[PDB]
Amino acid sequence: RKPPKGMFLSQEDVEAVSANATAATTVLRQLDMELVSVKRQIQNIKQTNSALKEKLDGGIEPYRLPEVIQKCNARWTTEEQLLAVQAIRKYGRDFQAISDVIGNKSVVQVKNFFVNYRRRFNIDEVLQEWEAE
């Protein structure tokens, strides 16, 4: 039913190498050249990628910031409330960002907070302003 293993005798390939007297060495060098093309291409991106690597030297260690470890509280100080209204104004609804900004209240409180202080801080009016941008 099928050829010996490793032998790759397609029904369609034989005709292509049998089509003409020099057809064999045609297809065989049509690929000899195509291989070179990819090799050429590999060097290029290997250079381009190598150049980009150099630019990233230093990584971002110098631009890194120490992490704050502050115990989440549950009381809203007048300050924290104010941080909040601004965070909504600049984030809109990204719960994590707003919790990250206050860095003491959490996403549940933050999420709760909109409904608690709702008419009081005009959050709906604020949120429209965020969506404008």
Partner 1 sequence: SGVEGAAFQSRLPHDRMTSQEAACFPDIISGPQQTQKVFLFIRNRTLQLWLDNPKIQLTFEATLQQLEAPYNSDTVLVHRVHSYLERHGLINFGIYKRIKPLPTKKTGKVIIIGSGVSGLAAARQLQSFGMDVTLLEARDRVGGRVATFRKGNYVADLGAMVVTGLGGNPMAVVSKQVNMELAKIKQKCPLYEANGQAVPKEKDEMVEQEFNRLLEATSYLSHQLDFNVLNNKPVSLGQALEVVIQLQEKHVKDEQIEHWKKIVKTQEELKELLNKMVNLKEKIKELHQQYKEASEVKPPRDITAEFLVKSKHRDLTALCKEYDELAETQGKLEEKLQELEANPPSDVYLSSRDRQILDWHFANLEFANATPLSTLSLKHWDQDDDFEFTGSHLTVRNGYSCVPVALAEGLDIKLNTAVRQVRYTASGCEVIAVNTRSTSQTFIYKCDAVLCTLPLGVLKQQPPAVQFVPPLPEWKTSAVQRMGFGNLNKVVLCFDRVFWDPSVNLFGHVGSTTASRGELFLFWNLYKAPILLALVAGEAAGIMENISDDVIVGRCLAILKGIFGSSAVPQPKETVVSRWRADPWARGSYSYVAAGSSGNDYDLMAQPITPGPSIPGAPQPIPRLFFAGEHTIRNYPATVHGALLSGLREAGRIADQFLGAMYTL
Residues of this chain that bind partner 1 (CB under 8 A): 1-4, 6-11, 13-14, 17-18, 24, 27-28, 31-32, 34-35, 38-39, 41-42, 45-46, 48-49, 52-53, 55-56, 59-60, 62-65, 67, 79, 82-83, 86-87, 90, 97, 100-103
**In the bound complex, what is the minimum distance in angstroms from residue 5's beta carbon to partner 1?**
8
d(CA 11, CA 87): 67
DSSP output for the chain: --PPTT----HHHHHHHHSSTTHHHHHHHHHHHHHHHHHHHHHHHHHHHHHHHHHTTTTTGGG--PPP------S--HHHHHHHHHHHHHHSS-HHHHHHHHSSS-HHHHHHHHHHSSTTTTHHHHHHHHHH-
> Looking at beta carbons only, is 24 or 108 nearer to partner 1?
24
Which of 5, 75 has the CB closer to partner 1?
5
Nearer CB in complex with partner 1: 51/132: 51
Residue 87 Cβ, how far from partner 1 at the closest point, in Å? 7
Smallest separation, CB 95 to partner 1 (Å): 13
Closer Cβ to partner 1, 32 or 124, answer by number? 32
Q: How far is the CB of 55 from partner 1 (least distance, A)?
A: 5
Give which of 64, 56, 98 is closest to 81, Cα–Cα: 98
